[PDB]
RNA sequence: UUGACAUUGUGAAGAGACAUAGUUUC
RNA sequence: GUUCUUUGUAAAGUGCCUUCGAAGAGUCGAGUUGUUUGGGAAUGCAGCUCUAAGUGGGUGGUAAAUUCCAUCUAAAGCUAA
RNA sequence: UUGACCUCAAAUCAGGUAGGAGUACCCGCUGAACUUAAGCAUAUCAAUAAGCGGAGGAAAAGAAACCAACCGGGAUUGCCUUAGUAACGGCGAGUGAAGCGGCAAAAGCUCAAAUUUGAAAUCUGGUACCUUCGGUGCCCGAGUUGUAAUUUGGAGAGGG
């Protein structure tokens with residue numbers, strides 16, 4: 001059961017795997033229903049759009065924070081600055097997220113401004129009865145595309161004070177590495193009587 | 194903080210004009226209160242000490258705080274609670290059988 | 293769970309449909325294919341939009 | 344498809360092309376990777392030296408992401424400027440106005456220095472740089488500005 | 492109110508006043524039948540904070556369940572199999588004593604719904620519990636927007652399916668790195684990770 | 695089967711320590 | 721869409737000042753046994769022994785002491801797709 | 802002697818409820834060995850089969866005692882991916898998940914712990930009437946060993 005110069009495989013098929021095979025023979029079916037579902041909802045939902053207004057958010061972890069991406073909901077602060085309570089903001093098709101937290105003003109401003117633009121481009125029919133027919137835009141998201149902030153200018157003057165960048169990293173690496181040891185010499189030399 | 198704006202190092206990270214949010218009350222879930230302070234004080238002098246607590250203070254008066262922690266760490270979960278428990282005892286003693 | 297469908301690379305799929313469009317002119321091909329087109333004006337056959 | 348297959352061809356010959364003597368039986372060598380250290384060792388050392396036993400450090404809960412950091416060599420670099428715009432910057436090599444290239448924005452994390460870039464000044468914004476990359480870049484009158 | 496005093500007092504189980512109390516009560520209960528209707532919570536502050544309410548439609552039951560391990564049934568210890576499975580005597584039972592207690596009153600009051608249950612006392616032999624129940628056909632309950640959820644049929648025998656608090660404990664249902672196995676519901680999340688997903692246009 | 699712990703409480707004489715007041719242990 | 725009763729001396733939202741701010745225990749936690757998990761000086765579950773606090777408590781995938789930091793708010797509960 | 806209260810009973814007491822079935826899929830318990838390792842005990846088969854208890858049209862999960870370590874994300878479920886990877890493993894045969902990212906769908910909240918104390922403001926039931934999935938009057942009863950209003954950590958309460 002081992003021969004030739006072949007790569008070692010690991011095909012985990014030693015349990016009763018034939019009992020747990022899913023074929024999406026129903027791929028076309030679900031697409032249709034999915035679509036039917038959406039057409040039905042757009043109806044029921046009267047002139048409202050199918051989605052909620054979502055906040056901009058810088059993504060987490062070292063690998064994705066260059067990108068910005070739709071978050072969940074707007075934060076009690078952003079809603080407040082945007083000139084509305086959240087109780088209401090919720091009835092107006094704005095998603096609000098009581099657990100997200102502002103620590104970054106650039107994003108904060110962005111979001112408030114997102115709310116201003118939203119508020120101004122929506123229209124809220126009176127409670128009354130009249131229902132002045134106004135036709136549905138289906139996507140809050142299409143209407144208000146989240147985009148990546150521009151971070152510089154195309155071209156610009158060159159400023160070289162001389163400091164290797166490389167060697168700056170090297171040095172920064174270093175400082176952190178011996179931060180603790182130097183603190184022990186600092187303690188240990190303070191205990192000089 | 195303030196981040197250094199480079200990609201390794203001590204205060205590593207991208208510089209952002211920062212904000213410091215409002216504070217969540219869910220961050221003060223431990224905090225005392227005069228109500229619960231009052232009650233807990235009250236219940237204590239009703240129900241008094243408990244078997245392992247008696248052994249603690251006597252162990253304190255008769256063998257020091259370190260031998261008390263060592264026991265109390267066994268009795269309770271751990272060294273940190275034991276710290277706290279011994280203290281609490283130290284203060285049953287001072288407050289009462291002293292001043 | 294036999295494989296029933298087959299993937300063709302989108303681009304190659306075009307290379308083909310393109311090719312097939314190109315041969316709908318080229319009367320010999322059309323003729324050779326069934327298709328009784330000896331007695332038609334010219335090929336491609338383009339008919340009024342009014343259709 | 345079945346019609347092109349060699350079992351169609353074997354029909355009528357007794358042994359299906361697997362021998363009268365040594366048959367085709369269930370699992371002669373054992374199953375799977377059995378015997379790796381015994382009756383299948385000649386095939387393993389040779390073809391798979393290195394297989395048995397251990398090296399280095401275990402790392403519990405390693406998160407590839409932490410170490411995300413694609414390399415781009417100078418070798419390209421000028422690729423991250425759109426063509427049109429590119430030619431425009433090559434000619435008019437200059438301080439006062441040189442192109443800014445955010446290499447993080449192109450999704451790379453380190454610039455390395457594979458091989459020769461023309462003398463045009465670039466301003467290069469990166470998380471990390473090889474010593475050489477940053478050297479070759481200055482030799483064209485550019486710099487590296489460290490971002491994050 | 493008193494309930495805050497009850498609460499704190501009950502955290503002193505080794506206190507002189509409490510262990511008098513505890514020793515007397517545990518004798519009483521053991522004289523009574525293993526499942527018996529209770530007149531009223533003996534821990535009113537506990538019951539309360541778990542859903543109890545002093546209105547017709549809430550019932551309290553007291554119950555005993557034997558302590559210790561689960562001795563593996565099997566005649567004469569004989570296990571017939573590999574030796575990892577030859578064990579019989581250090582075997583522990585994945586549900587909890589508390590869960591058995593909910594289950595045995597649950598069956599005893601099929602017309603009722605178990606809401607929750609709290610510990611009251613133990614000895615060498617038994618752990619004692621009070622189970623608080625609701626009557627879903629009782630009109631006082633069917634009105635009351637807060638509790639009529641219990642009146643639905645999806646909550647038939649929640650104790651039998653580990654959907655009460657104890658049940659959800661042992662069922663491993665919590666969020667986090669510590670619960671990956673057991674969280675969407677262990678058997679289900681297993682089945683998931685062992686399903687072979689084949690698309691029309693194979694990936 | 696043997697030990698420890700838990701179920702486990704109340705007196706009394708006697709041993710045992712802060713080092714010959716009685717909280718504590720056999 | 722119409723139409724009748726006005727539910728009110730009712731109910732709800734928001735700005736500033738001040739004082740407060742109650743938040744689940746034989747549980748968390750620990751020891752040990754056994755089972756389980758990719759979870760490694762121990763991933764979950766259970767049995768028995770021990771058993772908390774309130775600037776506390778849990779988590780931070782290598783045990784420990786020390787010092788900080790980050791991050792949620794357990795031991796009660798409902799909920800469409 | 803008379804009347805309570807606590808606790809425990811009885812009735813062919815007035816009205817209700819549970820059982821059994823089905824069980825593809827769902828929530829638990831319990832629990833194998835054949836097999837693979839070319840032998841075999843750990844391992845594997847498998848947290849599988851068989852046995853048991855319990856639901857629904859879905860069930861379960863669910864508004865974080867979460868993920869993270871970032872310029873931070875933000876209920877749950879599922880698909881694509883992460884990945885046959887981190888890791889486990891007579892480190893042998895074998896096993897083996899998670900965070901980030903895209904997408905489907907989207908949705909949020911309730912108690913406990915508080916003096917209404919210038920007024921238990923709450924509720925089952927019987928009954929007569931009615932415009933009967935209910936309302937109103939009245940009478941027993943429940944309930945202060947706490948039924949409503951009020952508040953749920955995002956807060957929120959009392960004063961001004």
Ligand SMILES: [Mg+2]
Pocket residue numbers: 012013017685686687
């Ligand atoms: Mg498979």
Ligand SMILES: [Mg+2]
Pocket residue numbers: 014015836837846
């Ligand atoms: Mg097999």
Ligand SMILES: [Mg+2]
Pocket residue numbers: none
């Ligand atoms: Mg199918």
Ligand SMILES: [Mg+2]
Pocket residue numbers: 050051
């Ligand atoms: Mg949508």
Ligand SMILES: [Mg+2]
Pocket residue numbers: 128129130131
């Ligand atoms: Mg209207």
Ligand SMILES: [Mg+2]
Pocket residue numbers: none
């Ligand atoms: Mg083939």
Ligand SMILES: [Mg+2]
Pocket residue numbers: 344345346347
């Ligand atoms: Mg064929």
Ligand SMILES: [Mg+2]
Pocket residue numbers: 346347351
């Ligand atoms: Mg042929």
Ligand SMILES: [Mg+2]
Pocket residue numbers: 352353
């Ligand atoms: Mg041939």
Ligand SMILES: [Mg+2]
Pocket residue numbers: 352353354355356
């Ligand atoms: Mg032939």
Ligand SMILES: [Mg+2]
Pocket residue numbers: 356
């Ligand atoms: Mg031949």
Ligand SMILES: [Mg+2]
Pocket residue numbers: 359360361
């Ligand atoms: Mg052959």
Ligand SMILES: [Mg+2]
Pocket residue numbers: 357358362363
């Ligand atoms: Mg033959």
Ligand SMILES: [Mg+2]
Pocket residue numbers: 394395396
């Ligand atoms: Mg190997």
Ligand SMILES: [Mg+2]
Pocket residue numbers: 416418419457
């Ligand atoms: Mg290259």
Ligand SMILES: [Mg+2]
Pocket residue numbers: 547
């Ligand atoms: Mg009653």
